[PDB]
Design a protein around this ligand. Structure first.
Ligand SMILES: CC(=O)N[C@@H]1[C@@H](O)[C@H](O[C@@H]2O[C@H](CO)[C@H](O)[C@H](O)[C@H]2O[C@@H]2O[C@@H](C)[C@@H](O)[C@@H](O)[C@@H]2O)[C@@H](CO)O[C@H]1O
Ligand SMILES: [Cl-]
Length: 241
């Protein structure tokens, strides 16, 4: 067990230890690794390659700005990966490609403005994708195929519309977060999101420390009227970004 951490069974707790880097001596038998709430700024390539039995990896609340390619490739048993509240500007191609058993992926509160095109293509079991508080300007391609999602958090980005049909196959959704985006209700492309929210009022949520059902929390930019109230006749294809 690493000096600065505490260990019990197969859980290694290095949370809130003022760590500047991943400590040495994490046993290969570790299944749960808390590295959150530290000041880790960089992850060496291969730092996790030994930890083939990892099931939950908490890297949230650090100072990561990038990730090396292949960082998680050995962690095939991973079901929860937390990267929220770092400063990630981008993700490398194929960063999640080997995490076929992943169920929860936390990417919120970073500086991501886009994702690689195939970033989610192998996450055939993902149930929660949490991506609030970034700089996303378009819905990442591949979310349309994450049919087992129950939680999708897109709040507080820079999204102006949702591509037509993007949510139609997400029939297991119970929590959808859309507030805090400058939805462009003059542009004709807004109609899909308008029509989808009107048909899914019970699953659109806002956040006041916890989930609160509010289908009106998706608001039109410039005004304070809900996206779901927009009439098609008030929109035009010529007023799109
Ligand atoms: C790993 C983990 O459990 N992370 C939690 C975050 O996911 C939570 O973030 C909140 O997530 C919901 C979706 O479930 C929604 O997207 C909220 O907007 C988001 O909260 C944002 O981020 C927080 C850090 C605060 O800045 C809040 O004001 C934001 O609106 C947070 C909730 O505090 O808990 C983490 O543990
Ligand atoms: Cl329409």
């Amino acid at each position: 067990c690493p000096s600065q951490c505490s260990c019990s069974g197969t859980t290694v707790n290095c949370k809130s230890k003022s760590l500047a880097s991943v400590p040495a001596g994490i046993p290969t038998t570790t299944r749960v690794l808390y590295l959150n709430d530290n000041q880790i700024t960089k992850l060496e390539p291969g730092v996790f390659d030994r930890l083939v039995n990892l099931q939950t990896l908490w890297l949230n609340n650090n100072q990561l700005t990038s990730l090396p390619a292949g960082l998680f490739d050995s962690l095939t048993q991973l079901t929860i990966l937390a990267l929220d509240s770092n400063q990630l500007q981008a993700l490398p191609v194929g960063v999640f490609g080997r995490l076929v058993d992943l169920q929860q992926l936390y990417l919120g509160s970073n500086q991501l403005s886009a994702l690689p095109s195939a970033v989610f293509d192998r996450l055939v079991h993902l149930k929660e994708l949490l991506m609030c508080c970034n700089k996303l300007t378009e819905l990442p391609r591949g979310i349309e195929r994450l049919t087992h999602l129950t939680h999708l958090a897109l709040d507080q980005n820079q999204l102006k519309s949702i591509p037509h049909g993007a949510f139609d196959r997400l029939s297991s959704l119970t929590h959808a977060y859309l507030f805090g985006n400058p939805w462009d209700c003059e542009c004709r492309d807004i109609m899909y999101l308008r029509n989808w929210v009107a048909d899914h009022t019970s699953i659109v949520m806002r956040w006041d420390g916890k989930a609160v059902n509010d289908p009106d929390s998706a608001k039109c930019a410039g005004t304070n009227t809900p996206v779901r109230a927009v009439t098609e006749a008030s929109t035009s294809p010529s007023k799109c970004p």
